């Protein structure tokens, strides 16, 4: 794999192999997404899920949602990439998580990033605020926090005011991934990635994962991507066998533009490629990456 990245860094085509695969990209009908009543609950009128891969709410009433179940068969994990919420679609975000059983939610951007809003506070910031979500009978409480540098962990009690059924779901919140950007290396990323690994909330015992950035697929779909190629690394009996343009396209599949940047797809090449040595069996990286990823400051 460090092979390709090694030439196509000298080749210094990293734009060249990004367009292609924007031409190789999937392109499947989004109606339910543009009909007219659907427009409030759409951040980006260029965003949007596919009919086919479309989160479906369980109301009666719209169950549109601008939401896509990703589903990688051979690797065997399924995720949910969806917008940032907005003010009117924080109670359907939620009522999503509840309907699909998911555990944990994976969040790589600020509510306002560069003086610009990207996503609504959706779940509360303190304990003593728990908020409700009227119109689908939920309520959401912040039960604790585990703040680090450059990523926060927090533990979110869910409950159906119906039923008075409750649920932990945890909330993995990378703070300073950047817009069109990337992380400020593989060693915090990976380090990031294998916290939620580590907490449960990918098991197949769940639902799916749900991850979100603004628009749920730049940041996300490098997230997805690198999780994705190393399960398969995992899996397979040659490593080297995987074909992360190929896997992108797979994804693809599903929702549409994920990876934003040439940059974003050259740095997904290097967290498998960095992340390939943990799963080779090298015990001394895990450490090395919290320590450059200075999470305790
Ligand atoms: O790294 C990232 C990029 C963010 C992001 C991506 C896309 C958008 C949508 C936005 N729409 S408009 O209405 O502001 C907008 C801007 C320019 C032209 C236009 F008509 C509408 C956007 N779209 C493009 C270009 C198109 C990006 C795209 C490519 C394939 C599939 C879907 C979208 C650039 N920014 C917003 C944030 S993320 O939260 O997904 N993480």
């Given at each position: 794999?460090?092979?390709?990245?090694?030439?196509?860094?000298?080749?210094?085509?990293?734009?060249?192999?990004?367009?292609?695969?924007?031409?190789?990209?999937?392109?499947?009908?989004?109606?339910?997404?543009?009909?007219?009543?659907?427009?409030?609950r759409?951040?980006?009128?260029?965003?949007?899920?596919?009919?086919?891969?479309?989160?479906?709410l369980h109301q009666?009433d719209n169950?549109?949602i601008?939401?896509?179940?990703?589903?990688?068969?051979?690797?065997?994990?399924?995720?949910?990439?969806?917008?940032?919420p907005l003010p009117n679609t924080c109670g359907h975000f939620w009522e999503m998580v509840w309907e699909?059983?998911?555990?944990?939610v994976?969040?790589?951007?600020?509510?306002?990033?560069?003086?610009?809003?990207?996503?609504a506070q959706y779940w509360p910031?303190?304990?003593?605020k728990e908020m409700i979500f009227e119109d689908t009978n939920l309520k959401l409480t912040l039960?604790?926090?585990?703040?680090?540098?450059?990523?926060?962990?927090?533990?979110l009690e869910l409950e159906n005011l119906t039923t008075?059924?409750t649920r932990?779901i945890?909330?993995?919140?990378?703070?300073?991934?950047?817009?069109?950007?990337?992380?400020?290396?593989?060693?915090?990323?990976?380090?990031?990635?294998?916290?939620?690994?580590?907490?449960?909330?990918?098991?197949?015992?769940?639902?799916?994962?749900?991850?979100?950035?603004?628009?749920?697929?730049?940041?996300?779909?490098?997230?997805?991507?690198?999780?994705?190629?190393?399960?398969?690394?995992?899996?397979?009996?040659?490593?080297?066998?995987?074909?992360?343009?190929?896997?992108?396209?797979?994804?693809?599949?599903?929702?549409?533009?994920?990876?934003?940047?040439?940059?974003?797809?050259?740095?997904?090449?290097?967290?498998?490629?960095?992340?390939?040595?943990?799963?080779?069996?090298?015990?001394?990286?895990?450490?090395?990456?919290?320590?450059?990823?200075?999470?305790?400051?």
């Amino acid at each position: 794999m460090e092979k390709e990245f090694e030439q196509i860094d000298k080749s210094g085509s990293w734009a060249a192999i990004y367009q292609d695969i924007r031409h190789e990209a999937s392109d499947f009908p989004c109606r339910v997404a543009k009909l007219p009543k659907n427009k409030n609950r759409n951040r980006y009128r260029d965003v949007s899920p596919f009919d086919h891969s479309r989160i479906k709410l369980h109301q009666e009433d719209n169950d549109y949602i601008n939401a896509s179940l990703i589903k990688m068969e051979e690797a065997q994990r399924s995720y949910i990439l969806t917008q940032g919420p907005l003010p009117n679609t924080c109670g359907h975000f939620w009522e999503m998580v509840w309907e699909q059983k998911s555990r944990g939610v994976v969040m790589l951007n600020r509510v306002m990033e560069k003086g610009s809003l990207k996503c609504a506070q959706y779940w509360p910031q303190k304990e003593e605020k728990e908020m409700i979500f009227e119109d689908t009978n939920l309520k959401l409480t912040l039960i604790s926090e585990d703040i680090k540098s450059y990523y926060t962990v927090r533990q979110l009690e869910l409950e159906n005011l119906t039923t008075q059924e409750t649920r932990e779901i945890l909330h993995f919140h990378y703070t300073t991934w950047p817009d069109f950007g990337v992380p400020e290396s593989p060693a915090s990323f990976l380090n990031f990635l294998f916290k939620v690994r580590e907490s449960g909330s990918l098991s197949p015992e769940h639902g799916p994962v749900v991850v979100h950035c603004s628009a749920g697929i730049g940041r996300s779909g490098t997230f997805c991507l690198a999780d994705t190629c190393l399960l398969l690394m995992d899996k397979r009996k040659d490593p080297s066998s995987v074909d992360i343009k190929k896997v992108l396209l797979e994804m693809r599949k599903f929702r549409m533009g994920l990876i934003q940047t040439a940059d974003q797809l050259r740095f997904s090449y290097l967290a498998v490629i960095e992340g390939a040595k943990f799963i080779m069996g090298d015990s001394s990286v895990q450490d090395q990456w919290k320590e450059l990823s200075h999470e305790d400051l």
